[PDB]
A paper describes a structure:
To gain further insight into the function of the UBP protein, we determined its structure using X-ray crystallography. The structure of the protein, solved to 2.74 Å resolution, revealed a homodimer. The overall conformation is saddle-shaped with a basic, concave undersurface and more acidic on the outer, convex surface. The concave surface is maximally 32 Å wide with the stirrups at the bottom of the saddle approximately 22 Å apart. Homodimerization is mediated by a reciprocal strand-swap of the C-terminal beta strands of the protomers. This strand interacts with the neighbor, forming a 5-strand beta sheet. The interprotomer interface encompasses 1662.4 Å2. Examination of the structure reveals a potential π-stacking interaction between tyrosine 100 at the base of the C-terminal beta-strand of one protomer and phenylalanine 13 of its partner. We mutated these residues to alanine and in both instances observed an altered profile on gel filtration chromatography in agreement with destabilization of the dimer and an elevated population of monomer species. Our initial determination of the homodimeric structure of UBP in the absence of DNA suggested the establishment of a symmetric structure of UBP at the origin.
We identify a hitherto uncharacterized protein factor that we term UBP (ucm-binding protein) that interacts sequence-specifically with the ucm and determine the structure of the protein both in isolation and when bound to DNA. UBP is a highly abundant protein, and we reveal that it plays a role akin to bacterial nucleoid-associated proteins with over 300 binding sites on the Sulfolobus chromosome. Importantly, UBP interacts with the N-terminal domains of MCM. Taken together, our data provide evidence that UBP functions as a general nucleoid-associated protein that plays a key role in facilitating the egress of the MCM replicative helicase from DNA replication origins.
Residue numbers in the entry:
A (entry chain B): 1 to 61, 69 to 78, 81 to 109
B (entry chain A): 3 to 66, 69 to 108
Write the structure that this text describes.
Amino acid sequence: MIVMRVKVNEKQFDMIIDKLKLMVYEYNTKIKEYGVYLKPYHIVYKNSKRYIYIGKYWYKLKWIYLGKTKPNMPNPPQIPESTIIKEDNEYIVDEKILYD
Amino acid sequence: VMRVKVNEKQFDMIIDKLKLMVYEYNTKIKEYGVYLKPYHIVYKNSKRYIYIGKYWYKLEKIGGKWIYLGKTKPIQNMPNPPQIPESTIIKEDNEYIVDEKILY
């Protein structure tokens, strides 16, 4: 396999997050039966970067993170694994401010 | 060659330098009820603008603050501010490396 990695802006990134909430929303209202929640991503601040992990990350009621596998539940829809990296923020400044 | 691109660490330094520029002034004009913030942060078409300049605020309570005043020294017999330059900093859009196939 060749897997490419490509750059998208914040608006595109919210797209990927928003769909992942959308495809688990109908399931997640179903899980009120067992009082657990499937959040389809996990955000990690390591190496002075936002890491934004895509996967099944399970929460139990201050919602505690049980882990990454089903704790007799109904089998959510499939989430890909993948890794999303925030680029460092960058600012357009006029030089004179750097010059002072 | 006026406009260049810097990262958060340098931009944080830029903000930090400005805050030190006004720190001693704000202690001196603490007693007038007045705070001089040397920048103003604006969310316009979903970018974070940071304008550099004199932005004056006053302390008042209503019920239970920091109401904006103006760009200019509110009281003629306060000590003069340090010279903030007027300039515009624009934060670029956040950018993400994504696995290709997650794009459907």
